[PDB]
């Protein structure tokens, strides 16, 4: 592959084209060309960048020189070089003889002019000026007409993308003009790139000390602003002078943004530093990402694509508007592409070392540039300028990491000032408008900010390569499901927010999930003070997390907002805003409801009652009629919880999910007291959850008859749970061991419940060790208050031994399929290639697990950073991690496929569908329709030979190259050794009441 210095120089040239510093890039070109030993690094793209730049300027004088440099270097001109030549001849309006001669040279060169136009990435302005250049030579040249957009014709996605049948597509309850206004609001919010929200803490009394603290912080911030401006100017002059003496600098990378914007960004990251401090590499990553995002937004602002996206979005909103009717109903992506689609300039991100040195330089600039007086606590004494941030080495085992900890007087001034505002990025806030439809892995969730289709912890990763080398119609289902999940309009439950604010502003209630303030922390004998500081710091961390969450919830109290959605590498869907979403804690799910409601209908109140009994955590093993009768028995408690949440009998606090139970009690209380229960418009999301859903999929692929009955794939009157069966086996083993007088059984007694055994039984069907189950049950025993805490370790070992003894001779097909997946992953990862597979909806999935962690040490003023070069510099795959990842990753990919099929086929029936993982939420009116569609999509997904098609795909891709056959023949034995299905008529899943419940 390309060298690191080659990548850095190419990024330098490309940034010069963006910053209009074409004279500077030509200077490095002639410096690196006039001398020999570094000229072996220059490639064709490096010359074509400056070629295209001089083309946009219409300068023949330098372009002929660069062409002479290309000819002298010994490398042949490519398509983009002649495209740049045609561009520069077309821009200058010069006569037809030269364009005729050069296009004759193009024809003599033999490469197609249509290949210059098509399948090679150019801007539309470049295409237009090449068209203007060619129209003087050949006025009879015409580009091929635009083909109609292709339609995905896969069997799972053939009911969708079908012109026949009646479709009742959902429409938002907002009109067209209000949606356009919210688009304007979100466009302004993303242009500003930051959001300021009011804190939910009670405001401090504005005394003299508070105002003097605020004035001191203000004058320090002004001094830091001026100092950072001076430091940034000195750095840019040093980089410009360092460039002039022939070295690759970062100079165009710091002129991408304005000086004020960079200084303000550094001040913002300085403001949001925790008192403990952050890693230097973390600050480098975050600073580089913020700079890249602001570069993208600024480039789209200057280039004029904001107005194009605006004019296209006002036309696109007519499909989803209540009062606007399209001539033919279709999906949001299909309507986005049916109109004139604006061109999305694919902006290549910076290389990982370039990002690292940019963030490292900006972090070092923040550390050196900011000065403070001697101590902010009592600053009246004579002051030496000490740094605001300190670079302290923090030590964990042999490892030594650099941490930028703020000075404690700066910290003390920060909590003494009591700043009433909090600042978020525009990416970290829920969108105010419907998101852009997912039309490509590039054009995605947000209006202007770049957003990945697949979340990746690593910087440069091969996921987008599979997302772009796929067939164009392969990703249509996943992108449409992402658009559908992002199109759900959310609304904050104000009453639950009022009660959580009541508990948060006062002394918190940790029983209900509201963090207590650290000022109420409790205060041999010498160890107790350190223990109290540890407890106070834990409550400091959790309350700060809640401070972000409830502030962002208060910011969205009276506005309809949207949660844009992404995937991971194996397909599971997450909302992009991290703080306030529906995948969070019980409080966060309680605050959220649907912004559009449905009338309950003849059997909608029953679903609300069943959902409430499910949220109580009681009557879990009981049938639906028993849950409904139980809800009728506790009706007075339901009304007392709804009417008097904190001043009543407090029935809702005893529920397993208390705040969700309280919100559902309020919904049932308003529904029953209505005059017509069927006519009550309900906005509460009712949840249907899978019972052992990984085991449900294992029994679906295995076609077993015993495990499928255990995980409710066979119809039954009562629900079936394997967790309670294992719990009963462990409890009778505990009774036998307590009979013998063993101490651990006497300590445990009745403490073995479903919850302590649930995650381990859930996990044993993946490649878990006994150490993982040990920690799994040790955490569950540690969170129990009534358990004696000196017995946690030995009871954990005993309980793990009885749990793994209990699962013997159980789930035979599941263990067979998991062993086959683990064996196949081990034989793939023993070779060089990592494990790849294609989902039944067509999504390619690869695992980013590689052994080599390159040091990639970068010298600098403060220290040398250590980052793993993730852009395939790591080569050897991590065999153990591939083995331990593949059996869960496949099952979760099939989870994603089932979820996307259910969403896409509930969209055609007019159902609002959102999904936590194996938890499908819809309106209480249409729970039965969602259940029926979920069962049919489960049948259609699992009527496909997923194991057999996986085996044929794996043999076709990873077992067909000749040079590996002698080593892969055993793998050819493994891949074609899938277990037999057996006898289980899977159509009975359509009659299973307790499939999802």
């Amino acid at each position: 592959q390309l060298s690191g210095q080659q990548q850095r120089l190419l990024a330098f040239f490309k940034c010069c084209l963006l910053t209009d510093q074409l004279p500077l890039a030509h200077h490095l070109l002639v410096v690196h060309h006039g001398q020999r030993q570094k000229r072996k690094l220059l490639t064709l793209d490096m010359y074509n960048a400056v070629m295209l730049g001089w083309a946009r300027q219409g300068a023949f004088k330098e372009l002929v020189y660069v062409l002479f440099m290309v000819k002298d270097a010994g490398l042949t001109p490519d398509l983009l070089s002649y495209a740049a030549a045609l561009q520069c001849m077309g821009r200058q309006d010069q006569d037809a003889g030269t364009i005729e001669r050069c296009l004759e040279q193009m024809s003599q060169e033999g490469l197609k002019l249509q290949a210059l136009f098509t399948a090679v990435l150019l801007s539309e302005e470049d295409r237009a000026t090449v068209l203007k250049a060619v129209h003087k030579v050949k006025p009879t040249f015409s580009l091929p007409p635009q083909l109609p957009p292709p339609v995905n014709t896969s069997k799972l996605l053939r009911d969708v993308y079908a012109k026949d049948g009646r479709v009742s597509y959902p429409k938002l309850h907002l009109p067209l003009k209000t949606l356009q206004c919210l688009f304007e609001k979100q466009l302004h919010m993303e242009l500003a790139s930051r959001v300021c929200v009011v804190s939910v803490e009670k405001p401090t009394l504005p005394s003299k000390e508070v105002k003097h603290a605020r004035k001191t912080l203000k004058t320090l911030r002004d001094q830091w602003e001026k100092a950072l401006c001076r430091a940034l100017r000195e750095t840019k002059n040093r980089l410009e002078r360092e460039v002039y003496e022939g070295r690759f600098s970062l100079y165009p990378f710091l002129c991408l943004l304005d000086e004020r914007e960079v200084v303000r960004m550094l001040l913002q990251v300085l403001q949001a530093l925790p008192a403990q401090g952050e890693s230097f590499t973390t600050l480098a990553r975050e600073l580089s990402a913020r700079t890249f995002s602001r570069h993208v937004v600024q480039r789209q602002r200057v280039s004029g694509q904001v107005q194009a996206l605006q004019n296209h979005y006002r036309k696109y909103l007519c499909l989803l508007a209540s009062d606007a009717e399209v001539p033919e109903p279709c999906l949001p992506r299909q309507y986005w592409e049916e109109l004139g689609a604006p061109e999305a300039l694919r902006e290549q991100p910076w290389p990982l070392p370039v990002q690292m040195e940019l963030g490292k330089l900006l972090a070092e600039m923040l550390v050196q540039a900011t000065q403070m007086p001697c101590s902010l606590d009592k600053p009246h004494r004579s002051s030496r300028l000490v740094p605001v941030l300190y670079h302290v080495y923090s030590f964990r085992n042999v490892q030594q990491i650099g941490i930028l900890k703020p000075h404690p007087a700066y910290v003390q001034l920060l909590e003494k000032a009591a700043e009433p505002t909090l600042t978020f990025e525009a990416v970290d806030v829920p969108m105010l408008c419907p998101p852009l439809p997912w039309t490509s892995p590039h054009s995605g969730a947000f209006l202007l900010s770049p957003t990945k289709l697949m979340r990746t912890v690593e910087g440069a990763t091969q996921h987008q390569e599979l997302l772009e080398t796929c067939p164009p119609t392969a990703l249509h289902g996943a992108l449409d499901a992402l658009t559908q999940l992002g199109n759900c309009a959310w609304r904050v439950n104000g009453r639950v927010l009022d009660l959580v604010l009541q508990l948060f502003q006062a002394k918190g209630c940790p029983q209900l999930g509201v963090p207590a303030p650290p000022s109420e922390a409790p205060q041999e004998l010498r160890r107790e003070l350190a223990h109290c500081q540890k407890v106070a710091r834990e409550m400091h961390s959790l309350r700060a997390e809640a401070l972000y969450r409830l502030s962002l919830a208060q910011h969205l109290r009276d506005r309809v907002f949207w949660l844009p959605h992404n995937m991971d590498f194996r397909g599971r869907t997450y909302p992009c805003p991290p703080h306030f979403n529906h995948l969070g804690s019980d409080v966060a799910r309680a605050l959220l409801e649907f912004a559009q409601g449905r009338p309950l209908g003849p059997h909608g109140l029953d679903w609300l009652k069943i959902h409430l009994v499910n949220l109580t955590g009681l009557k879990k093993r009981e049938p639906l009629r028993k849950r409904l009768a139980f809800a009728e028995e506790v009706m007075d408690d339901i009304l007392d919880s709804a009417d008097q949440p904190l001043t009543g009998r407090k029935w809702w606090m005893g529920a397993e999910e208390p705040w969700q139970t309280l919100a559902c009690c309020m919904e049932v209380a308003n529904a029953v007291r209505a005059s017509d229960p069927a006519a009550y418009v309900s906005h509460l999301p009712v949840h249907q959850d899978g019972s052992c859903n990984g085991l449900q999929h294992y029994a679906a692929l295995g076609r077993d008859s015993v495990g499928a009955a255990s995980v409710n794939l066979e119809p039954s009157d009562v629900p079936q749970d394997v967790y309670s069966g294992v719990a009963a086996q462990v409890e009778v083993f505990r009774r036998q061991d307590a009979q013998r007088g063993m101490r651990v059984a006497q300590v445990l007694e009745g403490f073995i419940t479903r919850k302590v055994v649930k995650q381990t039984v859930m996990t044993v069907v993946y490649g878990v060790t006994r150490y993982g189950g040990r920690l799994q049950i040790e955490k569950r025993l540690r969170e129990l208050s009534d358990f004696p805490q000196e017995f946690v370790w030995e009871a954990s070992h005993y309980l793990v031994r009885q749990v793994f003894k209990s699962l013997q001779e159980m789930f035979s097909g599941t263990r067979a399929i998991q062993h086959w997946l683990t064996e196949s992953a081990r034989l793939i990862s023993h070779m060089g290639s990592v494990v790849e597979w294609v989902t039944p909806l067509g999504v390619p999935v690869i695992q980013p697990y590689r052994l080599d962690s390159k040091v990639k040490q970068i010298g600098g003023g403060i220290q040398s950073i250590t980052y793993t070069h993730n852009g395939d510099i790591s080569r050897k795959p991590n065999t153990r991690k591939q083995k331990n990842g593949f059996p869960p990753n496949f099952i979760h990919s099939l989870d994603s496929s089932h979820m996307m099929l259910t969403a896409l086929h509930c969209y055609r029936k007019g159902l609002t569908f959102v999904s936590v993982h194996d938890c499908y939420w819809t309106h209480a009116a249409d729970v039965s329709v969602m259940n029926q569609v979920c069962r049919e999509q489960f049948v259609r997904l699992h009527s496909e030979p997923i194991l057999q098609d996986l085996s044929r795909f794996l043999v076709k891709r990873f077992c067909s190259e000749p040079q590996k056959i002698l080593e892969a023949s055993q793998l050819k034995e493994t891949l074609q050794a899938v277990p037999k299905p057996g006898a289980f008529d899977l159509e009975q899943v359509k009659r299973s009441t307790y499939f999802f419940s």
């Binding site: 403990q276 401090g277 952050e278 030496r384 302290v392 010498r526 805490q789």
Partner: protein, 309 residues
């Protein structure tokens, strides 16, 4: 596991642990008596010997010899590195608290200025020598575990590779690091014997094991240096030795808001003073001169949040 099983100079080590003849019969907490020959040689001296053992597989020999010596050998099953175990509730018979030891033996706590009440002999682990040095150093600076009961001398075998790593001074720039300064301020190492690998028959590239006789020093704790703020001093040492080529100014600009030039002017060391050329006593008095500064309030930036991030 390394075990002493040779009669060579066993009487010589016995005369080493005799000390002054006028002393009373002095308790010897021998650690891991595997073969029991060294315990027999120690019992030939006539003083009381208490065996602390991790090898319960061959347990009856020690107590069987103990009843023959009329109860002088009070054998109690315990491993020395495992006293006061780490976040553990249920006390197993291998690992037990020091209060259990000292309540069984009747011997009690004394003030730090008092005389030595007790002697320990035993092994370091074959590989975990550095970690066990850190356990004993943490128990010595924070006067807990054994060292709560007094100024407990402990005499054991040390590896050759880590010996001069503990005896290093200003000089030997390759091997001079934190544990040297941490121990040598309160340790009093004197090498008693220099035996090679041949006599040490491990029970089932020569390594020469030296007897280092750790004694806590009386003048360890001051007004500034306390058993509370010893982690701050430990962090000073490891931060200063993180960059060995750097100077004291470079590390103390990151360690304290105090001007390091003024602190070095007070201590008497120049501004060009490098970390590897500074005395172990100078580290302690550097900590004491930073600690006694009364004009400022925030004197250090170390806090337990620096354990992670």
């Amino acid at each position: 596991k390394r075990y002493v099983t040779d009669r060579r100079l066993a009487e010589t080590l016995a005369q080493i642990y005799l000390g002054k003849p006028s002393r009373p019969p002095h308790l010897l907490l021998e650690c891991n008596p595997g073969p029991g020959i060294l315990t027999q040689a120690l019992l030939e001296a006539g003083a009381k010997v208490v065996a602390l053992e991790s090898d319960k597989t061959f347990i009856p020999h020690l107590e069987s010899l103990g009843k023959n010596l009329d109860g002088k050998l009070r054998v109690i099953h315990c491993d020395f590195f495992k006293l006061d175990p780490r976040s553990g509730g249920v006390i197993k018979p291998p690992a037990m608290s020091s209060r259990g030891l000292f309540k069984n033996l009747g011997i009690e706590a004394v003030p730090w200025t008092a005389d030595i009440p007790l002697k320990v002999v035993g092994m370091f682990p074959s590989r975990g020598e550095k970690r066990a040095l850190w356990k004993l150093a943490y128990d010595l600076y924070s006067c807990t575990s054994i060292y709560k009961f007094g100024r407990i001398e402990v005499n054991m075998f040390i590896g050759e590779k880590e010996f001069q790593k503990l005896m290093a001074d200003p000089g030997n720039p390759d091997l001079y690091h934190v544990l040297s300064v941490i121990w040598q301020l309160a340790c009093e190492i004197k090498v008693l014997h220099m035996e090679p690998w041949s006599s040490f028959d491990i029970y089932t590239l020569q390594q020469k094991l030296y007897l280092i006789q750790m004694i806590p020093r009386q003048n360890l704790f001051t007004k500034n240096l306390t058993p509370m703020n010893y982690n701050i001093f430990f962090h000073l040492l490891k931060h200063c030795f993180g960059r060995r080529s750097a100077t004291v100014i470079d590390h103390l600009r990151s360690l304290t808001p105090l001007d390091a030039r003024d602190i070095l002017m007070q201590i008497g060391k120049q501004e060009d003073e490098k970390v590897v050329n500074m005395h172990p006593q100078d580290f302690k008095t550097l900590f004491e001169t930073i600690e006694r500064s009364k004009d400022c309030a925030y004197k250090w930036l170390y806090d337990e949040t620096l354990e992670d991030r």
